[PDB]
Amino acid sequence: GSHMEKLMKAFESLQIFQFKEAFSLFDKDGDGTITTKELGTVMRSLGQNPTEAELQDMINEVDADGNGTIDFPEFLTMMARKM
Amino acid sequence: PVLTQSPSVSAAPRQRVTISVSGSNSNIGSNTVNWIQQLPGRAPELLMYDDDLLAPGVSDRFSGSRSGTSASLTISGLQSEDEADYYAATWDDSLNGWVFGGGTKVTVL
Ligand SMILES: [Ca+2]
Ligand SMILES: [Ca+2]
Numbered sequence: 126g127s128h129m130e131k132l133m134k135a136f137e138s139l140q141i142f143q144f145k146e147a148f149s150l151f152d153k154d155g156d157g158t159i160t161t162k163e164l165g166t167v168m169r170s171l172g173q174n175p176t177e178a179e180l181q182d183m184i185n186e187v188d189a190d191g192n193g194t195i196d197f198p199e200f201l202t203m204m205a206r207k208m
Numbered sequence: 209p210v211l212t213q214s215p216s217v218s219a220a221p222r223q224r225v226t227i228s229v230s231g232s233n234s235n236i237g238s239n240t241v242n243w244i245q246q247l248p249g250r251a252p253e254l255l256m257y258d259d260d261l262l263a264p265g266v267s268d269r270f271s272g273s274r275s276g277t278s279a280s281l282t283i284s285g286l287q288s289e290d291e292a293d294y295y296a297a298t299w300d301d302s303l304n305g306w307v308f309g310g311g312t313k314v315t316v317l
Contacts, residue, residue: 135242135257138297141306142244142252 141201148200159184159195210235210307211296218315219286227281227294227312234302241279243272244295246311252295256281283314291316 151159151167161180168175175183184195187203195203214228231237243256254263259274269290271282279298283290296309 131258135254138242138306139244139254142297142308
């Protein structure tokens with residue numbers, strides 16, 4: 126059988142689900158995108174104090190489709206680099 | 209949510225509760241189902257995988273099955289510590305990615 130392969134795949138689905146919940150905590154709108162405004166609220170819940178331009182710059186570094194906001198796949202790329 | 213779960217349920221201790229999920233040929237029809245448990249104020253954790261196996265540490269009061277596009281999680285002797293949100297996960301061959309149910313809450317009386 127492939128016991129360890131099956132268990133490791135299941136833990137990958139749990140990791141994605143956990144990121145979906147994290148995404149949801151950023152997307153306090155529920156509109157499916159993370160704006161500068163929403164990202165700013167999360168950053169200040171941590172100790173941080175970025176300018177709106179600095180928040181836009183964080184967005185632009187993972188904005189693959191270029192619409193100026195973060196969707197779930199781009200959020201995954203942003204979390205990849207952080208973790 | 210690409211998967212649809214049975215509605216939230218209330219039951220008394222020692223009752224049997226079955227949560228169900230319904231998908232399509234390309235997800236549950238072709239891929240094994242995982243179950244995720246989120247206890248109040250805790251992180252979601254893996255509860256079952258490969259349809260019918262318990263994740264390490266999980267109570268054997270849990271059992272799972274998969275048939276066609278349906279899967280189910282049974283809690284045989286319901287206890288207070290089972291009060292939680294339960295989510296189904298699987299792979300979707302048509303979307304080439306993980307898909308999830310919208311969750312089912314179990315409340316114990
Ligand atoms: Ca939003
Ligand atoms: Ca974008």
